[PDB]
């Protein structure tokens, strides 16, 4: 009961430091999509078309 | 008639250069887009039939 309850607040404090990172986190994200669509066959495909 | 001397039985039509470049060989003629690089019935042909792709592109675009 005692261990859970040290993993409930581990829990509650990781939800905090989960949100008060999101917008860098989210920008990150955007950063990642942005430069994978830009390696794919698909991008190779209209370089050559162009 | 205005032939003097020769006259099929249909009247000569006098035909004109083309002024413009054929559909390429990759469009279809309706308005669903092209392949991005490869067409599909490519793969039902000879490897050594395949050559007209390349040879279209050389004729459309040089």
Redesign the interface.
């Given at each position: 009961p005692l261990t859970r309850a040290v993993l409930a607040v581990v829990r509650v404090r990781e939800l905090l430091r989960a949100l008060l990172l999101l917008p860098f986190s989210a920008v990150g994200g955007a950063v990642a999509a942005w430069q994978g669509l830009f390696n794919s066959q698909?991008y190779e495909?209209?370089l050559?078309?162009e | 008639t205005s032939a003097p001397f020769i006259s099929p039985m249909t009247p000569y039509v006098p035909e004109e250069e083309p002024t413009r470049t054929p559909p390429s060989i990759k469009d279809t003629g309706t308005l669903r887009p092209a392949s991005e690089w490869y067409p599909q019935w490519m793969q039902y042909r000879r490897r050594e039939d395949n050559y007209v792709f390349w040879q279209d592109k050389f004729m459309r675009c040089s």
């Open positions: 698909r495909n209209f050559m078309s | -």
